[PDB]
Design a protein around this ligand. Sequence first.
Ligand SMILES: C=C1[C@@H](C)[C@H]2[C@H](Cc3ccccc3)NC(=O)[C@]23[C@H](OC(C)=O)/C=C/[C@@](C)(O)C(=O)[C@@H](C)C/C=C/[C@H]3[C@@H]1O
Ligand SMILES: Nc1ncnc2c1ncn2[C@@H]1O[C@H](COP(=O)(O)OP(=O)(O)O)[C@@H](O)[C@H]1O
Ligand SMILES: [Ca+2]
Ligand SMILES: [Ca+2]
Ligand SMILES: [Mg+2]
Lengths: 362, 128
Amino acid sequence: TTALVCDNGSGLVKAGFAGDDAPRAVFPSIVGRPRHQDSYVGDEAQSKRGILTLKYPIEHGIITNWDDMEKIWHHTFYNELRVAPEEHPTLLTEAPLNPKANREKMTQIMFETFNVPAMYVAIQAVLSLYASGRTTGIVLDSGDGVTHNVPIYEGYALPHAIMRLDLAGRDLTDYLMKILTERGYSFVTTAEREIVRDIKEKLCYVALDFENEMATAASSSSLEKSYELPDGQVITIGNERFRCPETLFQPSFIGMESAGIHETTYNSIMKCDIDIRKDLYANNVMSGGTTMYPGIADRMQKEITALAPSTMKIKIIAPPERKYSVWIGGSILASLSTFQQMWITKQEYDEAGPSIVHRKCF
Amino acid sequence: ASQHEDAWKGAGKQVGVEIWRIQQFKVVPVPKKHHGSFYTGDSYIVLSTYHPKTNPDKLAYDVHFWLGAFTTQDEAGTAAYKTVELDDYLGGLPVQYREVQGYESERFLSLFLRILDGGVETGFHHVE
Ligand SMILES: C=C1[C@@H](C)[C@H]2[C@H](Cc3ccccc3)NC(=O)[C@]23[C@H](OC(C)=O)/C=C/[C@@](C)(O)C(=O)[C@@H](C)C/C=C/[C@H]3[C@@H]1O
Ligand SMILES: Nc1ncnc2c1ncn2[C@@H]1O[C@H](COP(=O)(O)OP(=O)(O)O)[C@@H](O)[C@H]1O
Ligand SMILES: [Ca+2]
Ligand SMILES: [Ca+2]
Ligand SMILES: [Mg+2]
C-alpha cells in the first residue's frame, strides 16, 4: 500500500507517490472552456489555450470553484497518475489561515467522491521545513496564490506568529502584464496571462538596490532582454524585469498597503518568544516558485539585516529544489508508518463527518 | 501515537546515550560499541538522558539529530520528524538540537567522535 502525496497549489498540481524523490505529475491547476460561448484540464488546456478561456479553481490558496476543483482531482488520479484513489491513502496540503470550510470540504470530497481509504491535511510550510532537515526555523512559502510565514519550534508551527499575505505569483504575473502593456505591448486575456507568466519566470530578478537598478536601466540597455512570443514577434523587456518582483518588498506597487515579505518575516519572528528568535533568524527557509527569482535570497538577507538588531546572525536557506520542497516533505512524512497512523480513516469520516479534520489535523 | 514506533520502547530509562540511524525511513538502533562513530552519508538521532541539577534521582533529556555531510534529503527529513516524535514520546521534555557534521555543538561534542566514509543507501526512489 503506497500513499499518494498531492500538493494542490494555486497555480500547479504537484502529485505523486510517497517515497519518490519528486512528484511524477506537475501540471497547471486550470480548467479551460471554449472562449467562444466541454472542458479541458491541465497541460492539455494549456496546450490549446488559443481557443480556450482558462480558469483557476484555486485563488489565493482557497478553492473558489468546487466543481472545477473536483475536475482537477479527478484528472490527477485517473488521467495523470492513473491510479484508483480508493486504493491509496492520500496526503493533501494547505496554506495556513484558510477558512475552515476549505479543508472540511476537501475532506468531504476525498472520502465521499473519491473514496480514499485514509487522508491527512498538512500545513505546507511545515512540510518544507522538514524537507530542509530542520525542526526549528521560519519558512517563507510563496506560490502562485499565497505568501505565508510560519515560524516552527521543535517541530511544531507557532500559529499565533504565522503571517499571511494574499500576494504571490499570480499577482506578480498580473502586474507584469500591466507594466508591459504600459511599454506598448498588450497582454490582457487569460491566454496572454500564461505568456506573461512564462516571461516572468524566465527573465525577472530581484534587484539588490531597487533605486540603483532603476538608474542603471535608464543609463544604458545593459539590463534589457529579448523574448519570442508564440506568434513569432520578439519583444524587449527592461526595468520590468525587476520592477515586477519588487512588488514582494513594496506591495504598494499593486495598491496594497501590506508589509513586504522582509517585514512580514521580521514581524513573524518578533511574535515569537525572545529566546528562540536567534534560531529563527539563522534558519529562514524559502519555499515555493515565487521564491525562485534570482537575487531574492540576497535581497532578503539585506532587508532583514536592516530590520533586525545590528549584531543578529541572519541566514537565508534557498534550496535549489524549493519549487518542490512542500511535496518532498510530504513524500518523506507519508513514508513513515507512524505518520500514517495519524491519518483520518474512511471509517472515522463515516462516523464523524468533515469535522474529523479538525481533531486529527487542525 | 509515538507508541507505534518500536525504537522508542525502553528509551530514556536510565542515564546514558542512545543512538539510532535512519535506514530507508526506518529508525534503526546503533550498537553501543559504535556510539561516537557516524557515517558521513547518514543521519542519526542521539538521545542523551541525564540527571538535572534540580533532582539527582530524576531524568532529563537532550535529543540531538546529527546530519552527515553527505546524507540524503529523505534521511535528514526522517531524522527531523522522528526527533519530534521521540520528544513527544517523552512528554515534550527533551530539548532538541540539530547537529551538522563539522558544526556540532559543544553539548554534542561533550557526549564523546569519529566520522566514517560512506553510509546506507537512500530510501528515495529516484524519478527519472
Ligand atoms: C505537518 C504537520 C503535523 C505533522 C504537525 C507537526 C508536528 C508533529 C510531528 C510529528 C508527529 C506529530 C506531530 N508540525 C506541525 O506543525 C503539525 C502540528 O499538528 C499536530 C496535530 O500535531 C501542529 C499543530 C499546531 C496547533 O501547532 C498548528 O500549528 C496547527 C494550527 C497546524 C498543524 C500543524 C501540523 C502540520 O501540518
Ligand atoms: N523561476 C521563477 N521565477 C519567478 N517565479 C516563478 C519561477 N518559477 C515559478 N514561478 C512562479 O511560482 C508560481 C508557481 O509556484 P508553485 O510553488 O508551484 O505555486 P503553487 O504551489 O501555488 O502552485 C507561479 O506564480 C510561477 O509563475
Ligand atoms: Ca545515507
Ligand atoms: Ca521538547
Ligand atoms: Mg504551493
